[PDB]
């Protein structure tokens, strides 16, 4: 189990806050330069917007 979650970090650079209600998407996104908080209310958004938005945090430059 650990190895897959480690790779999701390698891919997304996101670390979740595991102590919050399920309705709250909360965590931190890391990068070269300073780390950025995420705190969204899942009830306000579609599943696809949540995924598109979170993926837009991930840089596409090679």
């Amino acid at each position: 189990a650990a190895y897959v979650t480690q790779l999701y970090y390698k891919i997304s650079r996101i670390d979740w806050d595991y102590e919050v209600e399920p309705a709250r998407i909360k965590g931190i996104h890391y990068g070269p330069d300073i780390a950025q908080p995420i705190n969204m209310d899942s009830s306000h958004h579609s599943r696809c917007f949540i995924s598109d938005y979170l993926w837009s945090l991930v840089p596409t430059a090679w």
Partner: protein, 99 residues
């Protein structure tokens, strides 16, 4: 403990819409959902291995992407696996608007 690991996996699966499966013949299958907003559960997948030279190798892509060989060359050259995965998802998004 182990509960926290399974929880982390499910949070990434649901929030990124990305599942990772270890399948036969030394391969991992990456399955993206939440690509087509009109059909959020529809999967877009590719499979990957590390080949005998220790290189990334995409061994299949369903549906096919015409840029994924270019992406394989780039990830080999840069070792930037994050960007490789991000660019494949962008490419499935785009493909979903083609026709």
């Amino acid at each position: 403990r182990v509960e926290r690991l399974c929880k982390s996996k499910e949070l990434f699966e649901e929030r990124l819409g990305l599942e990772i499966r270890r399948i036969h013949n030394e391969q991992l299958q990456f399955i993206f959902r939440h690509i087509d907003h009109k059909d959020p559960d529809k999967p877009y997948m590719f499979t990957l291995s590390i080949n005998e030279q220790g290189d990334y190798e995409v061994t299949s892509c369903t549906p096919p992407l015409d840029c994924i060989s270019e992406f394989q060359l780039k990830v080999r050259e840069t070792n930037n696996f994050s960007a490789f995965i991000a660019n494949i998802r962008k490419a499935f998004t785009a493909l979903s608007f083609k026709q």
